[PDB]
């Protein structure tokens, strides 16, 4: 049917030419909660909004400040690889996390004492990569589709600083002085960048480890996320990585939701900092509580992109009838949360009986335990 | 069917869930003209991804800077209003210009000399309220849709001065003092803003005009756009409304396009600041060239906000079977457009074969009249 | 006695050391009215909170964006001349505007076209140096005291260029080889600025005057506002200088208000810039409204300065016994204000009951005619 | 008496109307020390000079950014709780210290692993709530009224996020699934934020404490300031308390600091951070030297803010008869202090000589141990 | 030879007025590289571009923000001491390293818990004073020339907080109340700043050493950069000195290079943070590579302060017959590098070969051994 912007006595049909799949798509923007209030910053964005970059080899779009102005500290890339094609050999300013949706694919990092990690990574793992350390990604035999964000919200995928594209912007007779080669032996290097390219599948990962004088790295760069134990509620799970597991995940904590069908991540909010959201799979909607009396209701699906600024109050309802899989990413050394329920569960029962006027029959339902994601009865 | 983000040899099918809806919407960015390079702000904003405000009476919706980052000049209101119904009595520090897409309004405007003027405007018509003089709105028995636009990128319509509020948050004593009554003859004031309520349908403009001993506003603060003759070219229209001809419209240009089927708003720039779009109807697309080898190629459809930043190559096509309807607004005193083909037409024939590599088969084509909307042959 | 911070059923003593002369000056700040609501930025601040730089022949002390940071645009100094003292002459960057509270002064300003004027100020008179020209002030038999405004917040009066200042800053030579003279005829140059200095009053007026080849300066530096017909209402007059009437004062629009004892400057705002006020005697009281629901109120008394950003809603009321005299002061080439009362009356009778519950007894006291000072009766 | 600016033969009398009360404040900004020079932002500014917000059960007022703009970093709030008044449970993205000036107070706070610490804090107690961690205050029987310091200038009290807030802006059907209960269960919830409301006073402290799965906080947050040992000198004391003693306090350090008629806080700098003061009771003067020549000097009583930026060298002197007594805060994990005695005393006798152009005499007089509060002989 | 704007076909003479000394010290610009490409800020100041503020005892120059203004976090002062001459007693803001280019001086520094350092500084030593400590320099009879770096870009050595000048400007009763004298005892301060002053020669650093009840300092503020053991390569040396091994260097990490004829600091790049440079002697070139295709190069010689933006590609190439010799530059905890050389050694050659277009001949030359500075066969 057609969806109109009527609640109640409030609103009224639309009278001019208008986005009807859109609307379909917002319910909840189209029309809002009652509750919902004020002017609040858009907190919402999709990646089929954006231009993609193709390749021979695959491609990536992007959703950064310029698309999604309130996310200032964190920006994101979607790329995608076909079998053996290569990300060159590049290196920026910006930690990169990453987390592997479909396929897998082969990593090289190499640190600043010379020591290199190569390792494969597929669904459900992670990768992370200090900041300036340079480092490849190449697909393997299913291809590779993978979502990387950036600890700077102003990056762009097309400005990485790439291994073909600095040489070929050196003096040829200071590559040759550098590696103690002639001019002649170097004459055939790229004239321009290749940034994806396609490449023949890589042989097996053990024949490519690469031994060296100056040792092991110290913690590894990749994580399998899903193989850890969730925290376990009724309506979902929350898988965990941050600094103080993932070791090398310094700027960037992580947490993969699933939200079953009639189940929400629970009222909560983050103390440490803003959280930035991309939404796997399903269908979502969450009100982000701004203080003063401020609040507005996103919906968001499959490829979109949200954000909580820092301390904000909020909850992510799963409203479809297939799981809701998403994703809440931190610029922090740690992942932390607050949940409305424990808090309360935490204090005098006729002090909160005092806030909320409500009774014991309220109070009684708290838990002191926390349970991230919750199921309706 | 299901579009694949493949041009040739470059790109690959997508492997993650994904938008399919909102990817049909946008082919030209899916698929980018080979065209396209480098990055690009985000030119693009739909009205259906933002939060409507439903009052009793209508509805209001906004896309401003913290939606479309890049138009930091330019904000605007989509607004509805039911028969009879008013948008309250307010001002703001903004100039508000307005198209009235459809139905019929009266306003209402009273100036920093105590004139007034009061209008019926009708579709095709608009307004033009200059910085902090206050006015209101009330739809006629058609009701009334249309888009506001306001000369800050970063203005909300939640924020307006209105005049119950300003009451409501005035001291009694000093109200009373002010008009020389008494407490109690003001006791019945709202307590808080109207904003947009219900009313009984007006009777006729000419019972409603307010004679005053400080004369008549020496320009009016509408104007009748589709009443005058438009620029005809081959593929469609333009009307121009600028301060040359709706002489109070001083911070606002605007032009209404319309592109027929297998036509497009031809190759230009403006040469004096930046275009903001709004779609009233039909499907386009527009590559903005952003020097230096930049480029990308947008999508738009009803109901979606555009932008090209001041002096900046572009052209609108229309890519659908619709007219093409669009409106180019400029916050300047004047409209001002260069054209690819009448500069080119208006330069040696030999001085622009040496540039573009061509012959006189091509200079041959030039014309010298400037035709805003060309026909595909 | 001693005032409390309660009014009705709210707020509590005072339990902690305080300030209770400030707290007898700011009854409507320790017990706001009712009506206030939310964080409104200072708009209020005494000269006597600053620092006084005394000099042989008199003293100065500012407010300024460092003091009073809403008040970007424009900044103030306080400045008083002993009989003869000389305020050195100067330059800079900004324009400055001034108003003569007591006694008398002779200025001289140059021109770029190297047309002088001079001219003596008396008590109610204006001048108005533009941007960058050099000028003196030089206070006659009475001395002088004098309120200067300039138009940038961040001006500082001991940032001037002073004459002395730029000569002890040259090498001699080229000061000899620029006028034609020895450096041995120059070696009597003070080594620093005078800034304020004594000397001997001057003769008369007359006989200052300077004749030159490059004729009379177009248009007077000086005005006199208080022998201007003010606008008379029933609680008072102000007397409006802006660029229509002192023709030189670009950037300064001014009105000097009197508000008798129990009288206000009416409901209002203006629709084109911030105002910014001097108090030079009595006691007021102003809200300022400033949109969304948001109002906070102030106390002036002598000496103070005080704020209203653009287009908010204001009064300012008389709480004293003696006539409340101030300044209104804006950064543009007119001033320009709407009425509450007037805008209302203004418009169709059954509108203004539709917004505001009130029957045509409340609209029958309406008044076309613009009335800035109103009296309580 | 009728204090004047003037200083032996430099100033002159006040002609115009003035504020003799401010002027007795400020003998030393009226008639600023010859020692001072150029100019310095203003680095005083009262509570007395605030709006306060009264409620059922107290009051706040606050000096932030936009009343003092020097102070970037730090803003401040005077709270009262009348006895068993309730400032509601609530938190914000600023970290938040306080001392208890007058009674006591019951506070809870509830950290991200749900483990949950109620005390009791009185006059000299201190407590310290980190970024994002919810928390309330409830006074005893005595009522209370305490400073709050929050680690940004930005901060308004107004714009907390209250529990009450959060909910009445949160769909009913969300908080119901939240829960596990039904909307008719939670239709007594409140419509809008309480923020201070009165309530019966609390039962013992030992009743209230609640057990919980998640064990005891790891650091108490609260401390009791003035059951410590101070540094003792011969004119007052100095309570020191950052994250060295009280651990949790990680971006806040405190001094408070007593001070007898006769003495003063002596000649020193901070080396870390700027300093936001806060004046308890009695009457001070302190110059700030700004470098490059620069200083001014200001007074301050019970009620007011001052601030001395970034290593800017200061004394506050007591310029009354009753103590002085001032807190010194910083946004940093400890307090440090240079003094100058003891700099100057760590130094070669003849080197210090070779500067100050004084003899033995004065080197003599040099303390190798620092006595941050010196009496006068 | 006059030099000329041609390489080979591009290019002409120059036809108009020019510095020709200028252009033959720069060849690299007049004539850059056909692989520089793009707009790519300056990288490259001379301090012989700079005002000498000479005093009684010595001179010093700077290259701040303001000369320089990619350097945002990083300023410099070429100081110079006669011998004996001290740089007065002072403090700032800023830390400040230092490097001793010529001669010797004593430095003093005396801490926050009143600990004195004292100790003589030779060539090829560095020194380090954490933000705001208090300290001194006097040249011993040698006189002293040496290279000063703060970790602001903003700072000027003519800001600094003097000793004298602190006590200028406090009144001198509160300098006798602090120190326990009398106003006579004091009169002979000086009225104004000395900065720099000539002096007699110190005695023997051991007469100097300061006993106190304090202790002494855990961590010594000068460092003999010079005595290290240097990473050697083949074409020159690199001496290391950071937070890791001059400990108290916080803020600053450092190398000093030397490069022979006919060898290069290798291609590589800093993944912490911008580099800043000093040429001491010698002439060089640097390409840096900026990313997105654009590359400029720089030429240098002693006096010459460069730059390389965070994560640049770089080189430094000697241009001359004599060693040229740098100092490496960072606001950081450490120094870290990438050799270009290095990573690809340790990466599988044929993924390497993928990349390069190049075979085996190739990537057998690589070494996992970083060598800083490679020498041309
Ligand atoms: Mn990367
Ligand atoms: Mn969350
Ligand atoms: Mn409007
Ligand atoms: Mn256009
Ligand atoms: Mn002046
Ligand atoms: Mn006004
Ligand atoms: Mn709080
Ligand atoms: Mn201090
Ligand atoms: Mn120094
Ligand atoms: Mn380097």
Redesign the interface.
Known sequence: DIPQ???G????T??????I???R??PD?????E????????M?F??????????????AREVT???L??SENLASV?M???PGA?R??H???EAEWAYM???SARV?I?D?K???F?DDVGEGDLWYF?????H?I?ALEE?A?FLLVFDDGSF?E???????????????E??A?????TKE??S???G???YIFE?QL?GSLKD?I?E???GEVPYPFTYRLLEQEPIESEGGKVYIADSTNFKVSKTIASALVTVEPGA?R??H????THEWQYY??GKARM?V?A????????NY????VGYVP????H?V?NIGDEPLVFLEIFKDDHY????????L????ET?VQ?????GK??TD??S???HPV?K??
């Open positions: 912007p009527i609640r006595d409030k609103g009224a639309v009278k001019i030419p208008r986005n799949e859109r609307d798509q917002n923007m189209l029309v809002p909660p509750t919902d209030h004020g002017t609040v910053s858009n919402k999709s990646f089929s909004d954006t231009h993609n970059r193709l390749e021979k080899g695959g491609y400040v310029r698309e102005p309130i979607n995608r690889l076909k290569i060159e050999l290196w920026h300013k949706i479909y396929g090289t190499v600043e010379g020591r290199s190569i200090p900041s300036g350390l340079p490849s190449q291809g589709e762009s097309n400005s990485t600083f790439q291994l073909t594209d600095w040489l070929a912007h050196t003096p040829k200071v590559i002085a550098n590696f103690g080669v032996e170097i055939n290097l790229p321009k960048e290749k490449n890589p490519d690469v060296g004088p100056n929400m629970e009222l909010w983050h103390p440490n796997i799979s009100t509580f203080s003063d009396g401020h609040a507005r209701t996103f699906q499959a490829g979109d820092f301390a904000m109050g909850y309802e932390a949360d607050v949940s409305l329920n424990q808090w569960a935490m204090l005098p002090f005092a806030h909320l006027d409500l029959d309220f339902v708290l002191k335990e926390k919750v309706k009865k």
